[PDB]
Design a protein around this ligand. Sequence first.
Ligand SMILES: [Mg+2]
Ligand SMILES: [Mg+2]
Ligand SMILES: [Mg+2]
Ligand SMILES: [Mg+2]
Ligand SMILES: [Mg+2]
Ligand SMILES: [Mg+2]
Ligand SMILES: [Mg+2]
Ligand SMILES: [Mg+2]
Ligand SMILES: [Mg+2]
Ligand SMILES: [Mg+2]
Ligand SMILES: [Mg+2]
Ligand SMILES: [Mg+2]
Ligand SMILES: [Mg+2]
Ligand SMILES: [Mg+2]
Ligand SMILES: [Mg+2]
Ligand SMILES: [Mg+2]
Ligand SMILES: [Zn+2]
Lengths: 87, 129, 130, 219, 96, 102, 220, 25
Amino acid sequence: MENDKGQLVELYVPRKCSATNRIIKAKDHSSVQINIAQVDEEGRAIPGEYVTYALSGYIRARGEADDSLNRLAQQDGLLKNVWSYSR
Amino acid sequence: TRTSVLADALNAINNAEKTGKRQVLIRPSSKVIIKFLQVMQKHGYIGEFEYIDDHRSGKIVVQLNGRLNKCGVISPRFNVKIADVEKWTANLLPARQFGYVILTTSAGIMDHEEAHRKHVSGKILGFVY
Amino acid sequence: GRVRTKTVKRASKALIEKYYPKLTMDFQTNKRLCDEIATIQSKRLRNKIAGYTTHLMKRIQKGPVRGISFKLQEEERERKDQYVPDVSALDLSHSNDVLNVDTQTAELVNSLGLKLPLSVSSVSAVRDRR
Amino acid sequence: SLPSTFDLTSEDAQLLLAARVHLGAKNVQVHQEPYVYKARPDGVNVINVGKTWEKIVLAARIIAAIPNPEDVVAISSRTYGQRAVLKYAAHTGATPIAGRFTPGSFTNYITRSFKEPRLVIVTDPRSDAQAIKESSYVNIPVIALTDLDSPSEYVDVAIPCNNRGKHSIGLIWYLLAREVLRLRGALPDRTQPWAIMPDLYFYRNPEEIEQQTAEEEAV
Amino acid sequence: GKGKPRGLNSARKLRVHRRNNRWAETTYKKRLLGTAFKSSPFGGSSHAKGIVLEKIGIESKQPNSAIRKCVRVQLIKNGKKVTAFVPNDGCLNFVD
Amino acid sequence: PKKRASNGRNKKGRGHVKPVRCVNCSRSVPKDKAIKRMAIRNIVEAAAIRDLSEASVYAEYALPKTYNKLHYCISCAIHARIVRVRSRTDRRIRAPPQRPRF
Amino acid sequence: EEKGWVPVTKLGRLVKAGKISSIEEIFLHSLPVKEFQIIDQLLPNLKDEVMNIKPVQKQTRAGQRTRFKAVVVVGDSNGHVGLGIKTAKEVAGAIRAGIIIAKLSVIPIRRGYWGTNLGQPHSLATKTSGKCGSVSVRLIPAPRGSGIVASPAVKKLMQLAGVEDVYTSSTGSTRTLENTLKAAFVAIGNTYGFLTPNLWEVQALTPSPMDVYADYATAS
Amino acid sequence: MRAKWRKKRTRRLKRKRRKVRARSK
RNA sequence: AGGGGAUCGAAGAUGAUCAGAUACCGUCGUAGUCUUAACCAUAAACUAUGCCGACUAGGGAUCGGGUGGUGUUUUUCUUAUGACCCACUCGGCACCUUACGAGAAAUCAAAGUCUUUGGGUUCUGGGGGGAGUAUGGUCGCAAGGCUGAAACUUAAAGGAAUUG
Ligand SMILES: [Mg+2]
Ligand SMILES: [Mg+2]
Ligand SMILES: [Mg+2]
Ligand SMILES: [Mg+2]
Ligand SMILES: [Mg+2]
Ligand SMILES: [Mg+2]
Ligand SMILES: [Mg+2]
Ligand SMILES: [Mg+2]
Ligand SMILES: [Mg+2]
Ligand SMILES: [Mg+2]
Ligand SMILES: [Mg+2]
Ligand SMILES: [Mg+2]
Ligand SMILES: [Mg+2]
Ligand SMILES: [Mg+2]
Ligand SMILES: [Mg+2]
Ligand SMILES: [Mg+2]
Ligand SMILES: [Zn+2]
């Protein structure tokens, strides 16, 4: 990871599943990088400005990607009372 | 029957982590399991876990964080001298940089690094990394 | 026995896709058209091209067919698609100005907390033999 | 977050309920969907329309995120909604796939039907399963118009609605179109009903188009 | 799982189990029973001396067509008679 | 190699089943693995109903049907075309062959 | 060699334009590769070496069709490996297609420290396993100067990887070279796919290179 | 042979051997 | 051993095919087939999956039990039943789709939670023959069962799938 001197000797820092905090491999050819553009007060989408979610291929293949994404959106306050933390 | 309650606990936590859950329900609770959980919580492999009283046997609800990859119990609580602990940490833990052999000493239930620092050794409970 | 193998089909499809407005119903006209707008080594092959292109002309005048997609038929698609009734089917007009539903969706509407004209009517729980 | 202008109007909820979106779910229910509201004693689960519309606005944000419109591809093999997909892609810059998908169009790069869209929208996962799989193979989100019985594999944003009725899918496509157009900025503000009226999206079957052709030629 | 006992106080069963299953290896059985001594033509010995009784040309196995010239020898250590091969071309005539 | 999951016998939870005899080669075979067919037919064929109807004192009499269940051995039935070999992927289709009379 | 390379797929257009700088951002976003020109361009020093040519024989009623399975491994000896297996009729085409497949299938590895990190990592960051067929290989970290302890094939793959020291433990029938190489490749690619406490800080999800330069692609 | 038949032949040989043993004793 | 004695039927008696046929097919036909006491303890006694635990994924059905239904008919005017319909739950034979795990696969929702190797436990196997043989014990009236080698010989035997 970190050299004794203090240089980032590790090759590249990979992303992690924004839903399960699991690492996203290099050839994890099912993961998705969902973007959600911000909106201004009167209802326009600000270009080039967006929140990001990184969903691992595993959860997508399981079929629970929608539930995790919905939960994340409500935790970030992008959806109003759509997911229930008690089910 | 249910022989090692902690084996059940750690099997449940490992299965649910592999499945992808964020919380588990350890069905029977015991002091040793609680101490195991405190160790993992202090080191950060677990989020915020909760005990529930039932007047028969406690239940535990463990909020994971996905940082954990695999726990595991060494079910025959073998005897390890202060010398063989290096052999055990070579056998179980992937690399010496991290990973902890959680074992019980006369000073308490505690990982192998703290145990080395206190210069005590006892019986092996499990391994977490 | 005359089945018009791969090559004539491909050539005809490409010609119609590319040159729809300048192809006709008469055989000899299409023969001369394919003579001028395609390089064809033997006259018999060009004759077969003309024949199957005339067949395609008859097909397209009957109605649009699969596979082929020229720009002009997109205009027929535009005409048919763009047609729309002036009065919506949904906009609380038909069925004597009544939205006919059951109690549960009424509770849904009330819980959302918005004013909608409802007409509540329970449905029998009976399930038939079907 | 979204401002209160991004709340559900009475007009839109009325339009949704009139299209019988809430009556989509069948007898069978999958644990993949908490969008259920109540179980009708006749045996039809009723979809919580508020959460639906919220999924629509989320999806609209999703599409609005991507700058290049043709990087959104709308796919339908179900007859009931291929016309709506055509129209949707006509309105925006998205590209329409109707009916047969020509499998391998996302992965095999030699195919002339090669499209590599950053986003894909699917009318029905059960029908367009091949599209879902081939979107998975090359890292593409799918905004699938799921039912409460449609399986949820590889679908990231699942807009719950009716898929057995052409009215529901047509209207939901229109709503998604209206919202993405509004969030793009060309539409001035989200208060007026849009100039294009929703029923221009409904499916037109051959016998109905026959009747309308007769009526149009009558004059 | 792994249907062998695993508790701390099960050393006895594991030890007897291994001692019993060690009888499966051919080498271990040969060593313990001393088959290399009792019945082998050599008493667990690499070499031994003997006397040639007569000379035999044994025909080879299936794919090989030839005769391999061997000699029957009575061992001098115990008296068991056994055949033995003679390598190289011109060597049988060298064996008196 | 396991030819079939259900072992082509269909007991799964009875240990043993009473055997019944074949109707063609008189083989004793377990009743579950006995590929049975109900042969409902008339006492007369379609080419004889006319003669019997016109040679009947009762005008409206309807001729009765003969009922019997047929238990085959497996070899006779594979020989007698009533049961047919399938491709491996089509073995598992449990539903009876779709009715040609649609 | 006319590297004309009309670029299809957006990534090819981007890399030809030069907006992609290193395979770092290629692997950052699970970015798929379909043109070997991309991996050739980013890493110009892919040493290759054929590992085996195995003649395989299909049989139709007249004679035997004889094809060749070429198994090749490529790398830069600086943390990137690629396995390529390919069947073909002629040998030269076999190795060519195999090296192309290997270049597409290139993978970064995680070189770590045996202990007391000093200077440059030499071994893997952790114990790893890889199983293909019935051959299961175990790659376990090594102290400095211990050498690459492995069978010649896995040893040469690890040499092309760039690791100086690693111990190995193969189980099953590693006799089948192709299965062994697949297993070792999977194991050595798995090194990233293992959460290590030094790799715990949550990252900010930098925008994907496709999205930022999507204008450059779609040549018109 | 079928293993069944090998067992049966061996059983008959055992029967003959036991008859011979009973005769000898 | 004793009582039965219909059918069926090893051995046999035969009638045919066949080059041969004391085999397949056809007639008869003792023992057995059925019983009462006493033995025998073996089967492809197969799910070719030891048992007891915990966890991991959805789908209906089905059997038994228990819950609720302003449920449906029933009818004894109506309650109460019962029988059904809906929902759930406990336990059981199973089944369907799928793998995200497993396997060498065929396949498995256990054969998963096994190189990231440890829940408790019994019993087996270590190349194929030789051979479940010899010998020795022991049980059995007997048939035979249980236990059970080696000399020697061999480079394969075998599993799964693929193309012919
Ligand atoms: Mg205890
Ligand atoms: Mg010779
Ligand atoms: Mg077979
Ligand atoms: Mg039972
Ligand atoms: Mg008697
Ligand atoms: Mg006879
Ligand atoms: Mg005779
Ligand atoms: Mg008789
Ligand atoms: Mg037995
Ligand atoms: Mg058995
Ligand atoms: Mg058993
Ligand atoms: Mg042996
Ligand atoms: Mg034997
Ligand atoms: Mg004896
Ligand atoms: Mg066998
Ligand atoms: Mg085989
Ligand atoms: Zn029969």
